[PDB]
Amino acid sequence: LTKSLSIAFENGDYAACEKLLPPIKIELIKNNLLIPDLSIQNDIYLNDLMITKRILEVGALASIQTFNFDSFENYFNQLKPYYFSNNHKLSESDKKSKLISLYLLNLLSQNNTTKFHSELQYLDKHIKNLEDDSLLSYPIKLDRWLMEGSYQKAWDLLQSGSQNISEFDSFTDILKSAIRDEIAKNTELSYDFLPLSNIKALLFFNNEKETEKFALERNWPIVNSKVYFNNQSKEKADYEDEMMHEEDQKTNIIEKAMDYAISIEN
Amino acid sequence: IETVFVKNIRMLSFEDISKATHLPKDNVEHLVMRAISLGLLKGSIDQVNELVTISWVQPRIISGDQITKMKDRLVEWNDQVEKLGKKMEARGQSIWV
Numbered sequence: 001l002t003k004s005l006s007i008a009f010e011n012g013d014y015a016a017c018e019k020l021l022p023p024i025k026i027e028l029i030k031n032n033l034l035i036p037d038l039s040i041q042n043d044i045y046l047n048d049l050m051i052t053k054r055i056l057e058v059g060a061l062a063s064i065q066t067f068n069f070d071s072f073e074n075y076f077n078q079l080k081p082y083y084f085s086n087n088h089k090l091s092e093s094d095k096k097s098k099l100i101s102l103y104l105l106n107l108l109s110q111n112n113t114t115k116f117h118s119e120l121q122y123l124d125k126h127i128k129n130l131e132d133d134s135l136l137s138y139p140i141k142l143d144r145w146l147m148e149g150s151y152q153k154a155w156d157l158l159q160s161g162s163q164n165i166s167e168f169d170s171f172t173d174i175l176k177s178a179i180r181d182e183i184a185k186n187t188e189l190s191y192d193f194l195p196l197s198n199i200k201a202l203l204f205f206n207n208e209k210e211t212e213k214f215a216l217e218r219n220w221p222i223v224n225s226k227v228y229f230n231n232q233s234k235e236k237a238d239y240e241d242e243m244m245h246e247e248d249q250k251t252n253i254i255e256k257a258m259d260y261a262i263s264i265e266n
Numbered sequence: 267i268e269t270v271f272v273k274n275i276r277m278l279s280f281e282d283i284s285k286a287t288h289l290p291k292d293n294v295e296h297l298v299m300r301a302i303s304l305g306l307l308k309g310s311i312d313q314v315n316e317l318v319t320i321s322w323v324q325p326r327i328i329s330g331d332q333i334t335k336m337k338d339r340l341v342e343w344n345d346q347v348e349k350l351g352k353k354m355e356a357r358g359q360s361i362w363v
Contacts, residue, residue, distance in 0.1 A: 247353075258358040265361050 002027055002055070009058040017062035018071075028055055038085040046090055053082055057095045064102060064170055076103050083126065097131045098166055104139035105171035111178055116143070138168065142175075151183055155204065180204055184218065188229040196225045267307055270320050272335060277319045294318075 005024050008017050034048045041049075060075040076099070083091050100123060107116040120140075127136055138161060145154040158179075161172050180203050187194065187202065194202070200211045212222055219232040248255070269286070270276055280294050287297065298318050301307040309320035328336070 252353075254354065255357055258354070262358050262360050 002031075002051075005058055006054060009062060014062045014065040017059065018066060018068070021059060024055065028052075031055065038082065041086045049082070049090055053079070053093070057093065057099065060099060061095075061167065064167055067170060069106060072102070072106065092131065097127075097135055100127065100131075101135045101138060101166070101168065102171070104136070105168060105175070108139060108142070109171050109174040109178055135166065151179060154179065176204070180214075188233055192228065192230055193226040196222065196227070199227060267301070267323065267326075270307070271323050271326075272332070274339065276321070277317045280316055280318065283318070 002024060005017065005020060008020055031048070031052045035045050035052055038045075038049075056075055056079050060072060060079070063071040063075065079099070083096065085091075104116070104120070107113075107119065127133060133140060138157070142154055142157050145151075145157065158172055158175060161168065183203050196208065196211065199215070200208055203211065203214070205211045205214070215222055215227055219235060220227045220229055221231060269278060269283070280291055283289075283294050284291060287294070289297070295311070295313065298307075298309075298311055302309065306324050307320050308322040309318060311318050
């Protein structure tokens with residue numbers, strides 16, 4: 001029953017995992033009660049721990065493979081305290097090293113960069129040289145290139161990143177898109193216009209018809225094979241003036257001078 | 267004198283004036299200059315921006331149509347002070363002693 005999830009992953013039928021998982025979830029509570037959730041560790045508990053952990057890890061990979069990012073997030077959170085408590089004697093796996101690589105990609109692809117650095121700080125002392133960076137290089141180096149602002153080195157690491165498959169292609173494909181939007185925002189400031197050809201090279205497409213379609217949806221008109229970056233910018237700005245909170249945040253002349261006199265006079 | 271008075275703007279491109287009076291640009295420049303001598307308009311001329319910025323209009327007879335135009339200008343400033351006055355009530359609440 002419990003054991004079925006474990007052999008189902010080896011088949012390679014990863015939707016079969018998910019449709020099997022609900023009974024195993026009720027039976028996973030029973031597993032949690034056997035360990036004290038590691039508030040004391042013993043050798044009776046050490047056999048049991050492997051059981052509790054094994055169920056989570058194979059669900060975790062299985063969920064990513066059916067493109068259920070949500071379910072993945074919950075799994076990772078459960079698992080993390082189990083590696084975290086206690087001197088090592090069953091606090092790592094072959095699977096772990098791969099698992100941390102996948103979570104770091106999910107944060108980057110959603111563009112929550114804030115949580116990307118916090119999480120790495122906490123992560124650091126489990127992967128420093130003990131699992132080392134061996135697979136973890138892939139979101140880490142990408143990160144080095146994004147901070148520097150080498151969108152070029154960043155693109156190549158993704159491009160060579162498809163030869164080696166572990167299952168990272170579910171987040172590489174999303175990160176390809178993330179880059180384009182970041183570039184798209186930065187180039188509005190730089191210039192008003194780039195010819196159609198110069199747009200394709202920068203914003204990373206393989207068809208000149210995709211480049212033009214993307215622009216129309218994003219609110220740049222191509223008229224006379226020149227883009228007008230200024231359009232969207234005017235429209236966003238027009239919208240902020242449309243909504244009203246607005247008189248105080250900027251502050252009137254009259255308002256500044258009324259504030260001085262009343263501070264004094266109390 | 268009619269075009270400046272009735273408009274709430276007081277700068278006009280020569281193009282508008284040229285089309286109205288069916289004059290060249292040489293003669294708009296004389297006409298404007300004459301108004302200034304006789305004292306029927308006073309102002310100054312930018313032939314480099316191509317405007318005539320009038321700065322004073324001679325009061326004249328005010329007929330049925332003009333009163334309506336005069337009147338509307340007054341409603342706008344009346345409402346403008348009233349709106350503006352609420353904020354100045356609002357701010358500096360503590361002291362009105």
